[PDB]
Amino acid sequence: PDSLFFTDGQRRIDFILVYEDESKNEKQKRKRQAYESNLICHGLQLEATRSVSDDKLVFVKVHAPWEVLCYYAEIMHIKLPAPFEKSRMNDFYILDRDSFFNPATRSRIVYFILSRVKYGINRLVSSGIYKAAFPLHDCRFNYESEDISCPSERYLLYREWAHPRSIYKKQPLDLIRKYYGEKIGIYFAWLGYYTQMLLLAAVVGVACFLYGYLDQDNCTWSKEVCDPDIGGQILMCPQCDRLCPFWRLNITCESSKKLCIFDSFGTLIFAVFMGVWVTLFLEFWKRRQAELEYEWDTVELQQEEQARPEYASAVFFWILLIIASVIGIIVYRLSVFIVFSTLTPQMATSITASIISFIIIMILNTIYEKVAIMITNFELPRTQTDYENSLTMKMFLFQFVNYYSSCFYIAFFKGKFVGYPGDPVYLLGKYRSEECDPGGCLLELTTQLTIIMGGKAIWNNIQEVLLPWVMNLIGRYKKITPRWEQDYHLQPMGKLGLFYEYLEMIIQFGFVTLFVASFPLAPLLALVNNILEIRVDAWKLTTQFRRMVPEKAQDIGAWQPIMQGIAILAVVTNAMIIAFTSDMIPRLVYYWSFSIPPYGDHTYYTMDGYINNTLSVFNITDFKNTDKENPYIGLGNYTLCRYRDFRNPPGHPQEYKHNIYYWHVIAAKLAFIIVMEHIIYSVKFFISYAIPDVSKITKSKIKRE
Amino acid sequence: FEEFNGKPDSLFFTDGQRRIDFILVYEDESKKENNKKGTNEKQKRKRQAYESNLICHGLQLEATRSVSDDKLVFVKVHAPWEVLCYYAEIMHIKLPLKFTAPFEKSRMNDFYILDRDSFFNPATRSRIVYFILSRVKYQVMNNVNKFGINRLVSSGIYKAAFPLHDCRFNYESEDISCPSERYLLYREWAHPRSIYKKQPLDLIRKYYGEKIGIYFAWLGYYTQMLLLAAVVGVACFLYGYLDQDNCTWSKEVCDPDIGGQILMCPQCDRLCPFWRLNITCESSKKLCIFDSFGTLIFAVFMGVWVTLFLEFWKRRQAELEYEWDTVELQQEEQARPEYEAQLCASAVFFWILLIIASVIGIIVYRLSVFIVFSTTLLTPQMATSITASIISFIIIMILNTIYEKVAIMITNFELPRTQTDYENSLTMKMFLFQFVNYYSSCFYIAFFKGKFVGYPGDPVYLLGKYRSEECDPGGCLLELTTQLTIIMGGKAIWNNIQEVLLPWVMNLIGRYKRVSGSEKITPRWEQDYHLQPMGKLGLFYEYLEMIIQFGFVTLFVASFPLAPLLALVNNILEIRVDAWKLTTQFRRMVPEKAQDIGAWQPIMQGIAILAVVTNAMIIAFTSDMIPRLVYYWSFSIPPYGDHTYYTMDGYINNTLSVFNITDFKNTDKENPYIGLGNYTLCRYRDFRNPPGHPQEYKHNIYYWHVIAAKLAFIIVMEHIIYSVKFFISYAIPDVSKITKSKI
Numbered sequence A: 001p002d003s004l005f006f007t008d009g010q011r012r013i014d015f016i017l018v019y020e021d022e023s024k025n026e027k028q029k030r031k032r033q034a035y036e037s038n039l040i041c042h043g044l045q046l047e048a049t050r051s052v053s054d055d056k057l058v059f060v061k062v063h064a065p066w067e068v069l070c071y072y073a074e075i076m077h078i079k080l081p082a083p084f085e086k087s088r089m090n091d092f093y094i095l096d097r098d099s100f101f102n103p104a105t106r107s108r109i110v111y112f113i114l115s116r117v118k119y120g121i122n123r124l125v126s127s128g129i130y131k132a133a134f135p136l137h138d139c140r141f142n143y144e145s146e147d148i149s150c151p152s153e154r155y156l157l158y159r160e161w162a163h164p165r166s167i168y169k170k171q172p173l174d175l176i177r178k179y180y181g182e183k184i185g186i187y188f189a190w191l192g193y194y195t196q197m198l199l200l201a202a203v204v205g206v207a208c209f210l211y212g213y214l215d216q217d218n219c220t221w222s223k224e225v226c227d228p229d230i231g232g233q234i235l236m237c238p239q240c241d242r243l244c245p246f247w248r249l250n251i252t253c254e255s256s257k258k259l260c261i262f263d264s265f266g267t268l269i270f271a272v273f274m275g276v277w278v279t280l281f282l283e284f285w286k287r288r289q290a291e292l293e294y295e296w297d298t299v300e301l302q303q304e305e306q307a308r309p310e311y312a313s314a315v316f317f318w319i320l321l322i323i324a325s326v327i328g329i330i331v332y333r334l335s336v337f338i339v340f341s342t343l344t345p346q347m348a349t350s351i352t353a354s355i356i357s358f359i360i361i362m363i364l365n366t367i368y369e370k371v372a373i374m375i376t377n378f379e380l381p382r383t384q385t386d387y388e389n390s391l392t393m394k395m396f397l398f399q400f401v402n403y404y405s406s407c408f409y410i411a412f413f414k415g416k417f418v419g420y421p422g423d424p425v426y427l428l429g430k431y432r433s434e435e436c437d438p439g440g441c442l443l444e445l446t447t448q449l450t451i452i453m454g455g456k457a458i459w460n461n462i463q464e465v466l467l468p469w470v471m472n473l474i475g476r477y478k479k480i481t482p483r484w485e486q487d488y489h490l491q492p493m494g495k496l497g498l499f500y501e502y503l504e505m506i507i508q509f510g511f512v513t514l515f516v517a518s519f520p521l522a523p524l525l526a527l528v529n530n531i532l533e534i535r536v537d538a539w540k541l542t543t544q545f546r547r548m549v550p551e552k553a554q555d556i557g558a559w560q561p562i563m564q565g566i567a568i569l570a571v572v573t574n575a576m577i578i579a580f581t582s583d584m585i586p587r588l589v590y591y592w593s594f595s596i597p598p599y600g601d602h603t604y605y606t607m608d609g610y611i612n613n614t615l616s617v618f619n620i621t622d623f624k625n626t627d628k629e630n631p632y633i634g635l636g637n638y639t640l641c642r643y644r645d646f647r648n649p650p651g652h653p654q655e656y657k658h659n660i661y662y663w664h665v666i667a668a669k670l671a672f673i674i675v676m677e678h679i680i681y682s683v684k685f686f687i688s689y690a691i692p693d694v695s696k697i698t699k700s701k702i703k704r705e
Numbered sequence B: 001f002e003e004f005n006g007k008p009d010s011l012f013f014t015d016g017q018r019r020i021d022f023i024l025v026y027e028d029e030s031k032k033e034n035n036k037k038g039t040n041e042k043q044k045r046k047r048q049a050y051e052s053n054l055i056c057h058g059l060q061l062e063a064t065r066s067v068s069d070d071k072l073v074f075v076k077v078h079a080p081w082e083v084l085c086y087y088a089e090i091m092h093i094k095l096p097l098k099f100t101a102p103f104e105k106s107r108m109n110d111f112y113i114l115d116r117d118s119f120f121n122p123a124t125r126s127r128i129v130y131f132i133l134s135r136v137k138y139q140v141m142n143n144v145n146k147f148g149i150n151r152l153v154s155s156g157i158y159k160a161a162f163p164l165h166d167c168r169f170n171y172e173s174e175d176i177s178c179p180s181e182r183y184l185l186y187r188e189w190a191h192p193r194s195i196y197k198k199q200p201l202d203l204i205r206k207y208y209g210e211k212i213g214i215y216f217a218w219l220g221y222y223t224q225m226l227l228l229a230a231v232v233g234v235a236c237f238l239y240g241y242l243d244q245d246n247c248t249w250s251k252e253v254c255d256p257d258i259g260g261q262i263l264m265c266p267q268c269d270r271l272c273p274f275w276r277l278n279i280t281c282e283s284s285k286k287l288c289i290f291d292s293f294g295t296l297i298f299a300v301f302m303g304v305w306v307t308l309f310l311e312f313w314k315r316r317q318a319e320l321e322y323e324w325d326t327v328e329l330q331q332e333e334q335a336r337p338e339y340e341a342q343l344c345a346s347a348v349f350f351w352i353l354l355i356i357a358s359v360i361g362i363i364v365y366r367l368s369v370f371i372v373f374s375t376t377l378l379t380p381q382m383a384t385s386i387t388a389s390i391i392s393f394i395i396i397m398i399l400n401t402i403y404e405k406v407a408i409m410i411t412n413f414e415l416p417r418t419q420t421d422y423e424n425s426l427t428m429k430m431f432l433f434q435f436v437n438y439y440s441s442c443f444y445i446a447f448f449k450g451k452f453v454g455y456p457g458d459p460v461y462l463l464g465k466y467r468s469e470e471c472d473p474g475g476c477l478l479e480l481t482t483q484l485t486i487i488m489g490g491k492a493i494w495n496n497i498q499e500v501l502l503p504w505v506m507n508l509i510g511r512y513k514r515v516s517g518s519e520k521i522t523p524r525w526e527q528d529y530h531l532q533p534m535g536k537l538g539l540f541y542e543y544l545e546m547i548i549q550f551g552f553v554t555l556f557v558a559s560f561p562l563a564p565l566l567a568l569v570n571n572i573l574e575i576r577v578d579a580w581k582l583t584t585q586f587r588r589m590v591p592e593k594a595q596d597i598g599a600w601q602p603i604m605q606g607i608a609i610l611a612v613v614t615n616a617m618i619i620a621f622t623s624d625m626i627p628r629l630v631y632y633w634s635f636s637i638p639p640y641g642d643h644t645y646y647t648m649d650g651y652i653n654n655t656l657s658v659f660n661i662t663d664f665k666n667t668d669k670e671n672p673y674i675g676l677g678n679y680t681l682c683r684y685r686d687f688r689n690p691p692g693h694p695q696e697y698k699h700n701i702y703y704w705h706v707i708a709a710k711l712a713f714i715i716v717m718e719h720i721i722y723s724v725k726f727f728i729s730y731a732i733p734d735v736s737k738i739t740k741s742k743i
């Protein structure tokens, strides 16, 4: 009959026990009998029905009597289904005595009852005393509940909020929490608001990108890089020793023209904007958190102590952090190296290197997860919440290093401290430092960033959950068993599913916020991913997993400190990216200072001759201070070559030393860093303190009541 | 009512069994008043209604006629138990137990009740009676209720209302039973004869309540931390002083063969001539004293010290909050709308006034220096600096009162809803005004003095005819130190003298207006009526002065390592000064309770945050350590220098720039130099290319090297300091472990 009620009886099930009979080594049967007798004596109903499919598997079900169940529910601080008390029985309207309770809360109370009893959930499940135990879903998600009394909340919830037919509709948070629990509701609300503000971020980013894209005609330095009589005549020095010849500058028109898009004033404006956008996001999330705290029953008290089966060396963890970061850097370096040792060509090279690095990161993620689990379990935590917090911190640190090591290397430690061709830097010995092209490494930073974000999102939840949908779409266009057996045939979601989902969104937030300067279109990718992910998570949760007992929570949890830390780090990261990764500061300094008769020869500020007047000069006769075999020998009548660094020309009294322009530029860079950081922090503080002038609605009405 | 009994010190009713709690003082109609007898009718009717309501509510009260003046009538008060217990229950007043609750009659037997009248301390009785007096209503006119004892005095119905002191501070109470605890407080706490013994905060709380005990405990903890700071600062200064044989650049400046030959270049237009660098040997030695690595050590030590002070203060606050069992009363909070009450324009106008205040401060300092220099024609230069600082401080003190008055008027235009709103608005506005007024000159000296003046060929004028002033080769750090020490010391001395004197002289005037030959013994209430009132603001000005002192100690310590010693002397005097003025020259303030110091806490956190920026900027720009280090590490070497190994030798000569006298352009005042015709080139403090050269007088490589070093130092210092402070805040539990046990 696929009913939710006891056999031939009016009694609503709330939780199921399934055990494997040993009668087809009696210790397991003895433990089972003891547990069952204890449950019977403690005042719970029990009924067993054998599944037709497997005679070995025998299922057991329970119920909830009003008196004892309500008493134990009042045992802990439970509000209206304001601790429960018969003295306020008629204060609140009640239409019936058998259904007024929320079935989710009934399941939660029964689960707590089972947890408190001892002798079994943990030990019996782990050791095989009981195969599994879970509550029931209202009905099949395909078709409405056959029983009229059932509201078929699962059917409506699926059809309205899980199927991608409702991709555009609004999020029904009330049903989400009233069916699943407070944790799921708060997670989905946070995800929704995050998408909402990602919309504004995406609009602003698109505006800036268009502003850049319409400036291609007025991008002087790229034009000069292309004009053959200027770009082609420049002969750059080789970037390696034994496998690179002298190259003309104009071979990088495509790179420079693309780079002028992501290296314009629009990016600077967008970085400044995101600086305050992050603060606004935090402030309004506190708004919404207060609002949900008021509107929902989020005033549940916390128990002082909890029990766990397990009831410094932290330096070892940080050593693992260091080795992980070093491994990531070596992985990226080796990937680019192997792709090298073998219009599009350089772009395809960069894309392939990024793809290989992303693959290696994907493999490394599982290993890092396993080692984090092992090490944290070796610590013997006292409780469960502390266990989750320790996992959050350690897992997040591993993911952070594993995913951002290559990006940090590209941004900062690539082409920054390479000496002039006369005395190259071999920091470790026989390991030369890589150099960026004259434009900079910003373009490959953007390529790595976009490839990683895309690949991760697309491959992960997206692709894993999405095969059947595309299969059915292509197909279209181009024995009856009770509910408990069906739910048994499902698979559980474990105890870390919500943790993993939050981890994914937090990694996405880090990608969007940290390196926003390089890639102004990142918010658009994040928005698309979120719009799909909300429905993917909803569908998987409501279709492919057993029902989870609702829990009580008031905030996302351990992540808010991580969010604010990410914001405080992101401001400085963006400042450093604009200062060092990009070549906007040298360009501005040249335009304002070195185009004037004292140093230049133009009658007015202009960008003409920036490329020629910026690149340095090197002499072959001074090939090396070590005076060994040199790659400069022969190879034509070449006598002078140029390199991307600010040093005095040969013959100057300060031979091959940093010149005035270098120090002017570095001073400008440091001034920009300090001014931008101070202004952004000041605005952050003002906005945070302006809660009364920003947030007069939510707190006022929440305190009014 | 009934006449004077004959026992002066007695604080009881004429029977001797009822303890007084308040004295209401009104002016009778017995005289021949003028204007309206109707005004007298209304005043007497209102007074009668209020007294009738109070006597109905359950408070006894009997009056008496003053012996000296016939027109003075004193009205006593008294609260029997029943009303006392009921109102304590309404107030959530807790009593000593022996899992904690306020006082209720239902649990009357559950408390350690000692005696009829003794179980309740007089301070709490006074507070309860004060609330009873405040909440009551007396009449309704224009269909709108009129209530509040405060309004009666505001409109002039009552002269005053106050509790009573135990007995004379300088003699014991004639009544044996009386504790005379005022006597003990005077003997031990006030009366600087006990300058050293630790102040008994418990008795202070008992007598004057928590509102005063919190302030005095804060001051004591402040003083101890200043002892630590003064020891460390004296150590740093002593090291700087004993290390002078190795201050090379000062030796070069003083040396007649190096410094003497440097023919510097005139600063002014034509009122000051050429001069030789060796005339600044005294200033060079002073800067060696004040501008050593000890200054950096003290800057970083103070950066840590401010945070440590804040955290330990939080721990002490928690400890005291538990010890004085203020949790339930702190939770029980209710605010009453102001008795006086019945856009962004106010804020913007306030900000404009702030800007003009800053400009006025800068201008007054500049004019003081200018006039002290003009009047010219034991070092003459230092004498001039001291004089300038003296006039600057005089003008600052004069302008402080005007700024206080303007703040009061501005905050009065806006109508804060309750007393707390008014107090917080006043706190913010007064702090901003005092900050700007006191520190505008110091900020100018530190950051805007001799920083954007061009080379002599093309002098920089701010807006015309106003040439920018510039420092000597060493810098203006010594000028800043002189300004700071003079202003801080003068503020301390003048403020302490004013605090000690003004109430005393007012009391003396009042007494000399009553030289009537009483030659008798007079009652307690009548004698306590003559003391000063301690206007409703209260400890606001005390907190303000202490906050300004802390700002001086912390913000600018990078230029004056001896500031904590001056602060220590000031505070060890101020403890007893404030105690004496509060115990011997003022009527008993009504007790209350407070969570913390008040609105000042955000001010202190802001000051601590901005101190790091101020110190970093001072060391980077005001001082000259950074150019010295740059020269030592990167310009005494073959690429630019000549010395084989790093050294400070030849720093003065190799740094001072050059200028060719005939190269003066511009048509106005063509003859600032050519008059003498002695030489053809002068040296000035700036990094620019020498004559000739493709870029004649543009900034050279050394300038940009130095600027980059300065900015890098700022970044590194700010980041490390803030990171260390954040980590320290995270690590400190912020509550005592013992208190964690007790709670």
Ligand SMILES: *[C@@H]1O[C@H](CO)[C@@H](O)[C@H](O)[C@H]1NC(C)=O
Residues within 6 Å of the ligand: A228, A229, A231, A232, A233, A248, A250, A251
């Ligand atoms: C670069 O310049 C050289 C000579 O100026 C030339 O012939 C070539 O076509 C230009 N473009 C590329 C992509 O090499």
Ligand SMILES: [Ca+2]
Residues within 6 Å of the ligand: A461, A501, A504, A533, A537
């Ligand atoms: Ca997912």
Ligand SMILES: [Ca+2]
Residues within 6 Å of the ligand: B492, B495, B496, B499, B545, B574
């Ligand atoms: Ca004082």
Ligand SMILES: [Ca+2]
Residues within 6 Å of the ligand: B499, B542, B545, B574, B577, B578
């Ligand atoms: Ca004082």
